[PDB]
Design a protein around this ligand. Structure first.
Ligand SMILES: Nc1ncnc2c1ncn2[C@@H]1O[C@H](COP(=O)(O)OP(=O)(O)NP(=O)(O)O)[C@@H](O)[C@H]1O
Ligand SMILES: [Mg+2]
Length: 226
């Protein structure tokens, strides 16, 4: 029942997060296009595989991809440059493409099967990524009355995700795109934005009991880092 933390690769962002993203929680990253949401997801999918003294949880990953932006070679590069075996690392990421929102919801039920299978093995699932949490919902639920219906379906989907996080001690990491779609209650919302000089800036939103500064990071051949 203790909480585990997965390093993001950035010391700056890790400090903002209290050491990394938490198990038994849904962390939502949100921001405009190009703000680094997907690159952070890729980095986390490598970092979680590290031992705990290196910031990981010796864990496997389930990834629900909605817009086909998962890149196996980016995983390999990030792994390679952090001293891990690129091919081994891919072996422990289980990617499924969600065709629509209803399929996305079914894939969360299927994730529980994979989770159970690995639970008391040496590489339990420790990270579940949904990229994008909201893209299908934005496309499908549109027009008069759609706000209530969309928020309703999303809340149920997030409830499924919360259950998996808490029941199996897993960090859930979801993405959400904004044009400068309420994610019910993610545990923690992190706003990402592009800054000058190729830097990215992160800020915690509506978290008055947590740090109020901003983290600054780059996107490199190691994925995310200061
Ligand atoms: N291999 C790489 N090495 C370094 N930087 C990279 C690499 N791949 C992507 N990037 C950077 O990452 C940016 C895209 O980040 P990404 O994480 O895809 O944004 P995003 O928030 O997911 N965009 P969107 O899905 O449209 O809402 C690119 O514009 C590059 O600046
Ligand atoms: Mg993306």
């Amino acid at each position: 029942a203790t909480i585990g933390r997965i390093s993001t690769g950035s010391k700056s962002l890790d400090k903002l997060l209290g050491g990394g993203i938490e198990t038994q929680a849904i962390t939502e990253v949100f921001g405009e296009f190009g703000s680094g949401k997907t690159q952070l997801a890729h980095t986390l999918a490598v970092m979680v595989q590290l031992p705990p003294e290196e910031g990981g949880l010796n864990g496997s990953v389930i990834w629900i991809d909605t817009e086909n932006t998962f890149r196996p070679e980016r995983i390999r590069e990030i792994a390679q440059n952090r001293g891990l075996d690129p091919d081994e690392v891919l072996k422990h990421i289980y990617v499924a493409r969600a065709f629509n929102s209803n399929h996305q919801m079914l894939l969360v039920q299927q994730a529980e099967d994979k989770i159970k299978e690995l639970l008391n093995t040496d590489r339990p699932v420790k990270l579940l990524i949904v990229d994008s949490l909201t893209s299908h919902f934005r496309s499908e639920y549109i027009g008069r009355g759609a706000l209530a219906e969309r928020q309703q379906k999303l809340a149920k989907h997030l409830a499924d995700l919360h259950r998996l996080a808490n029941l199996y001690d897993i960090a859930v990491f979801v993405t959400n795109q904004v044009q400068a779609i309420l994610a019910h209650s993610a545990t923690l919302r992190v706003y990402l934005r592009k800054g000058k000089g190729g830097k990215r800036i992160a800020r915690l939103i509506d978290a008055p009991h947590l740090p109020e500064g901003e983290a600054v990071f780059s996107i490199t051949e190691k994925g995310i880092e200061d």
